[PDB]
Structures are given as C-alpha cells and as structure tokens.
Design a protein around this ligand. Structure first.
Ligand code: GSP
Ligand code: FOK
Ligand code: CL
Ligand code: CL
Ligand code: MG
Ligand code: MG
Ligand code: MG
Lengths: 328, 189, 190
C-alpha cells in the first residue's frame, strides 16, 4: 500500500516544518544548515532595526550607544556573502538587549518578521561558536523558502507514505495542480497565530483571511471534489501566547469573534486557559463553516490543533492521521 | 473522475522529424488558393507514402509544416535511421515537384531523438499528437536547419551508429533556442 | 474531396504562457501533469461547441496549446458568422478564466481573426483529417502571432464588417507582417 499526501497552505504556514518532523520521526550533513541559521539571525536583527524608524509612531533606542550598532547592521544588510565576523554577533546581541529594539519587536505584526526571530536572537552566544552544532529544534526553526515541488518518502509500520511539499506564496500556487491527480489526501496547514498579520505578497491582505480564502478554493476546487482534507491548525503555541498577552485582540481583526462562545463538545488540554480554548476553537470553526457548506459525503474535513516545531505533538497528530487514512 | 480521462502515454527512445516549407505565407500570396492546395496535396501525399515504407508514423500537417515520428507505436532500435531515411526521400520528392509543378517549394528538415508523450487532447476533433521538450527541440532543429538538407542533433547522431557522414551543423548560430540550450548540431551529407 | 469557399472566418486563439508553465520533472511525471491541465483546458473549450449559439463554429484542430476554428463552412445576415466567431473568442476567455480560478494560474488568451476565401478538404494519404487552406488562413494566424494578451487582433477587412455589426475597433497601426509586408490591423473593443 502507498499513500500520497499533499501539503498545501499559504506561505510560512509550516508546511516544510511538518516534512522535517517526518524525517526526525520516521526516517557535512546538518553542517550546511549552519549558514542558513546564521542567515535567519542576520535577517531577524536587521529587520527589527530597519523597522524602528518606519513605524508610526517610531520606536526610539533606550541606549544612545546602540545607534552606532544600528548604523553597523544597516551597513552590512545588503552584503552578498557575509563573513559573520565576531563583531557582528556582539552588535546583534547588544541591540537585542536594548529595550527600544524589544518594544519594536513586540510590534512585529506591523511589519514582516520571520517566526524564528526570538528563538535565534536568544541563542547568539551559541550560534557564534566555531564548534557550533545545530540541535534538532534549531533545524526545525530554520526558515528557508520553498520553490518547486519536493517529494519525501518514508515508512510507518511497513506502510508507505509519499509526501509532497509545495511553495505556499501566491506565485508558487500554480504548481499545485501538478499534484492533484491520484492524491490520497490533502493536509492543509494554517498559521492560527497570524491573525494580526498581513501577507508578504502585497502587505495588506490579512494572513488568516488569505488562508481562509485559500481553503475555500481548495475545498470547493473542481478537481478535488472527492479528496479529503486533514486541516492542521498550526502555531498553537504562538496563538496561546498572543491570546494570553492581551495586546492584540482577535475581535479587532475578525469582529465575528465577539459573538463566538466555546462549543459544548470542546476538548481543552489539561490546565488550558478558557480564553485560549475559545480562540483556538473559533479559528477552527471559521474553517469548518466552509467545509460544512459543501461536498456532503464526497469528502470530509479532519481538523487538528498542531505545533509543527514540537516533535511530540506531531508524532501524536500524525498518528491520528494514520487512523483517518486507513479507516477509509 | 475528477479529471477527464487522458488518452496519453509516454514513449522513450523515439525520433522526431520536422519538415517545413520556406516562405509559405509569401508563396500563398502569389499563387491561387486553388493551385496552392494542389501543389501541397501532391507533395504531402507522397510524403505519406514514403512514411509508411520508412516505418515512420506521420503526425499532422500544419499548413506547410509536416512532422512524423519513428519508433511508434511499437519500439524500434532502427528509429534514428528511419527518420534520416525519411528525410532523404522527402528532399528528393520536393525536387521532383519543384520541376513537375514549376513552383518554388523548398523545405528544411529537423531531427532529434529522445522521449515523447503521444496521444490526443480534448473531446472533439481528436488528432494523434506528440509533446515533450524533445519534440519542442526537434521543431527548433527544422527552424535552425538549412534549405534542402537534414539538420540533426548529437542525440540523433548517437542512435545512428555512425552510418551517415555528417558535417558541423552550427545550429547555434541560426537559431537562438539551439544556442541557449547548448545543443550540438550536424548537417547530413 | 475538396470544395472552395468565399467567406469563411478563421480564428487562432493561443495561450503563449503555457510553454513556460510546461516542465519535465520526476514529480510531474515528465510533463504529464502539465499535459493533463492542457487537456482540461482544451476540453472546456470543446464543450462550448455544444452551445446552440455556437452551432456554426467548426473546430479545425489544436496546434500545441493554440485553438483553431472557423465559421461559414456550413454555407448583413450574410456576415453574421464573423460576429459569431468573435463571440466564440470571448467565450474561450470565460472558460480560461474558470481554469485559472481552480489551477491557481493566470493564463491569458491571444486571439487573431480574419475572413475571406478558403479551400476546405483533406490532403495527404494516411488519415481523413479535415482542414482549411489559403492566404486567409495564413493572415488569421499572423493576427495571433503578432497579437497582444487579452486582445482580439483583426485585419482591416474584418474590422469593417465588425463595425456594421455593432462592434467598435481600435487601430493597432501598420505593422510589417512576415510574408505580407505592411498590414494595417485593429483590436476589437471590449
Ligand atoms: N513557534 C512556531 N513556529 C512554527 C510553527 N510551525 C512552523 N513554525 C516556524 O515558522 C516558519 C515557517 O514555517 P515553514 O514550514 O518554513 O513554512 P512553509 O509553509 O514551508 O512556507 P512556504 O515554503 O510556503 S514560503 C519556520 O521558521 C518554522 O520553524 C509552530 O507551530 N510554532
Ligand atoms: C504543450 C506544450 C508544448 C511545450 C509541448 C510541445 O512539444 C509543443 O506542443 C509542440 C513542439 C509539439 O506538440 C509539436 C507540434 C508543435 C505545434 C510544433 C508544438 C508547439 O510548438 C507547442 O507550443 C505552442 C506554441 O503551442 C509545444 C512547444 O508546446
Ligand atoms: Cl497561513
Ligand atoms: Cl517525541
Ligand atoms: Mg515551505
Ligand atoms: Mg514555412
Ligand atoms: Mg510554418
């Protein structure tokens, strides 16, 4: 038996991260990813710094000295093959400890910043070492853009799985079609936490809305009429964090939230704040409303609360997926 | 059925030949629509005869473009030879019609070998056809060929087992596609 | 056998971006998945021929990802078919837009239309494939090959007949068309 799984979703939703877990779970080497981790680091610090003056209102530095460090980062920003001298890390580290820069970090939904920003900036002293060895979590956080289609083959209890990873940005979606025919099932990934952000493509369209519209076009697609969709409501850790933080209200982006009350059949985790329960289930339902409205019997939608960088959770949810695929 | 049924199948180790008349739009402007068709029916009927003999399978006729494939429907290791032979008979056929009709008809022949997908597309007016980069390339060989000669690729040369005397084709200098794709071409003697 | 014609409207509708969409990889079965999408597109265009308002439209063939058709082969009530061809062009655009919505693509059509004398029949010696020939057919093709995305380019003669039917045209200017020379062409207004 051979199952062909197609990963779909908007850009930065977590599709590539899911594939990375499959290798970790079911499959000179990882030294090539060091450079990629270092790029994410340079990308994160330069984006926060360059964003300070453009915000409205503009965020100011807490330390005058750091202005020179700001000048340093912006001057090396466009450098092609950067050598990463030890000065760079000292500058990056200094800037990341400046409270002004952190205030600008808290407002990152107002601009375009990668997800692994805080994770790496907090590990500068680790990444800078010559004898640095990327941990498993480091490889899971590393962000590199997907262009083209990529097949990852693996086995779970002698059962074969062919997983296809695709680019999720607008211009990349035109290739998806090349994987529609003879697909066992689709796994749709959504950045549940990106409700207060806009997509890169135009800098205006809300990320969640884009995911919602993308789901509607997949669910109601003419060529996937009988194809089921396993829905990964990803980035649950970041959702919970934002919800509890109380600074960016969900109902200021999706007004309908103000009417929403947690369902009866809801199954929260142990000790989970009812506020987080409410938010995660609301997002879930916005997707179910679309799947509920059509198909009927031809195909079904199976949602799951996930966190792609958490290997435990992925083992758990993918095993749930195996039960869904085999039963029917 | 999500997608309509596709009547297409892949075939490796095949040779594609393209023949095209020079200045067809120019030629059609001068002579009658009636006589053009007679000169073309005379030419293509003969081509279709030569094709069955040389074991080539004619695909379509696009006004002045004539193309066939050797190695279909069943595999044949004699393929590259067939297409080369087919072009030989073609060029000679055009010469007889040039004199018999007194019309200025000239063609360029292009040959390439590789894999092709063949079959039909659509629901109505089915016509057997071939598609692939190799077919695309074969088409450009005709465009980058020379009047009254057979322009072949390195790939086609490797299937010919050295049975034909060739000379440097320099296809890269007459067609942008052949150059940008670093294709080595040869003209058959 | 063959029959001569006096007023047939020929149309070439290309999809110039398809060639770039086409690729060969182990993931796409060496271009088979791309040919599958082209099959859906061509099929969607074929289903239009079943519309009553298009009973006069005769599909001649497909050249790659290009669609070729004609009207008046079943023969200004005498020039009506020319307007039917243009309507058929707009319909193809509607079908191609539908395809774009579902395949997350942005294919645009480039149409060329002309009319005049043609010769209908079958040539060759292997299979009975109906086709049309003539200078008229050549110019229609040039109208496509020298056209613009999302536009219907027509010859001067065609723009005139189209004007008496209610269509309005914009002069593209005088362009040197290979084999013909300086031809004044037009774009049908939407
Ligand atoms: N905190 C957190 N980060 C996550 C989670 N899932 C993915 N990420 C991070 O988000 C980033 C983007 O994920 P990625 O998998 O690269 O996106 P993608 O869907 O493949 O993106 P693309 O190729 O369409 S442009 C990565 O840095 C990844 O580590 C999650 O559940 N929690
Ligand atoms: C369908 C895609 C693709 C790439 C496949 C292919 O091999 C072709 O169909 C050939 C070469 C091929 O089918 C042989 C006939 C002809 C008419 C020469 C084609 C066109 O040049 C196509 O391009 C156009 C412009 O339609 C092209 C190149 O398109
Ligand atoms: Cl998303
Ligand atoms: Cl684990
Ligand atoms: Mg990716
Ligand atoms: Mg020619
Ligand atoms: Mg030609």
């Amino acid at each position: 038996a051979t199952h062909r799984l197609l990963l779909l979703g908007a850009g930065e939703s977590g599709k590539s991260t899911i594939v990375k877990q499959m290798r970790i779970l079911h499959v000179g080497e990882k030294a090539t990813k060091v450079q990629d981790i270092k790029n994410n680091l340079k990308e994160a610090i330069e984006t926060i710094v360059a964003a300070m003056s453009n915000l409205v209102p503009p965020v100011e530095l807490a330390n005058p000295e750091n202005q020179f460090r700001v000048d340093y980062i912006l001057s090396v920003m466009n450098v092609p093959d950067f050598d990463f001298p030890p000065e760079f890390y000292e500058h990056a580290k200094a800037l990341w400890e400046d409270e002004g820069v952190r205030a600008c970090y808290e407002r990152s939904n107002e601009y375009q910043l990668i997800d692994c920003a805080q994770y790496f900036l907090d590990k500068i002293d680790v990444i800078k070492q010559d004898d640095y060895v990327p941990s498993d979590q480091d490889l899971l956080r590393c962000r590199v853009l997907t262009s083209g289609i990529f097949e990852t083959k693996f086995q779970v209890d002698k059962v074969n799985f062919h997983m296809f990873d695709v680019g999720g940005q607008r211009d990349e979606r035109r290739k998806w079609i090349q994987c529609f025919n003879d697909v066992t099932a689709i796994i749709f990934v959504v950045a549940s936490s990106s409700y207060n952000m806009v997509i890169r493509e135009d800098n205006q369209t809300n990320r969640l809305q884009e995911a919602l519209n993308l789901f509607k076009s997949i669910w109601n697609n003419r060529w996937l009429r009988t194809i089921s969709v396993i829905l990964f409501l990803n980035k649950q850790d970041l959702l919970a964090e934002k919800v509890l933080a109380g600074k960016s209200k969900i109902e200021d982006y999706f007004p309908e939230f103000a009417r929403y009350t947690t369902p009866e059949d809801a199954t929260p985790e142990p000790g989970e704040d009812p506020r987080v329960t409410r938010a995660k289930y609301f997002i879930r339902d916005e997707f179910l409303r679309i799947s509920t409205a059509s198909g009927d019997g031809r195909h079904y939608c199976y949602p799951h609360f996930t966190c792609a960088v958490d290997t435990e959770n992925i083992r758990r949810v993918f095993n749930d997926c195996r039960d869904i695929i085999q039963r029917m | 059925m999500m997608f309509h049924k596709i009547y297409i199948q892949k075939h490796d180790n095949v040779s594609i030949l393209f023949a095209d008349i020079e200045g067809f739009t120019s030629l059609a402007s001068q002579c009658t629509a009636q006589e053009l068709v007679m000169t073309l029916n005379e030419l293509f009927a003969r081509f279709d005869k030569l094709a069955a003999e040389n074991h080539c399978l004619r695909i379509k006729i696009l006004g002045d473009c004539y193309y066939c494939v050797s190695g279909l429907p069943e595999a044949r290791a004699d393929h590259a030879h067939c297409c080369v032979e087919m072009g030989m008979d073609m060029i000679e056929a055009i010469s007889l019609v040039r004199e018999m009709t007194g019309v200025n008809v000239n063609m360029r022949v292009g040959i390439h070998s590789g894999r092709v997908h063949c079959g039909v597309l659509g629901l109505r007016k089915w016509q057997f056809d071939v598609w692939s980069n190799d077919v695309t390339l074969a088409n450009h060989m005709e465009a980058g060929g020379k009047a009254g000669r057979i322009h072949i690729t390195k790939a086609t040369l490797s299937y010919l087992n050295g049975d034909y005397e060739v000379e440097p084709g320099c296809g890269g200098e007459r067609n942008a596609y052949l150059k940008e794709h670093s294709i080595e071409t040869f003209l058959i003697l | 056998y063959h029959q001569s014609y006096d007023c047939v409207c020929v149309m070439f509708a290309s999809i110039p971006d398809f060639k770039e969409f086409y690729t060969e990889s182990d993931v796409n079965k060496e271009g088979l998945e791309c040919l599958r999408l082209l099959n859906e597109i061509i099929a969607d265009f074929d289903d239009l021929l079943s519309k009553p308002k298009f009973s006069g439209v005769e599909k001649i063939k497909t050249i790659g990802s290009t669609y070729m058709a004609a009207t008046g082969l079943s023969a200004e009530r005498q020039y009506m078919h020319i307007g039917t061809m243009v309507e058929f062009a707009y319909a193809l655009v509607g079908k191609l837009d539908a395809i774009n919505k579902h395949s997350f693509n942005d294919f645009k059509l480039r149409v060329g239309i002309n009319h005049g004398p043609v010769i209908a029949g079958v040539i060759g010696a292997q299979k009975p494939q109906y086709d049309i020939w003539g200078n008229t057919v050549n110019v229609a093709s040039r109208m496509d090959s020298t056209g613009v995305l999302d536009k219907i380019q027509v010859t001067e003669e065609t723009s005139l007949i189209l004007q008496t039917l209610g269509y309005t045209c914009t002069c593209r200017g005088i362009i040197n068309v290979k084999g013909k020379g300086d031809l004044k062409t037009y774009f049908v207004n939407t």
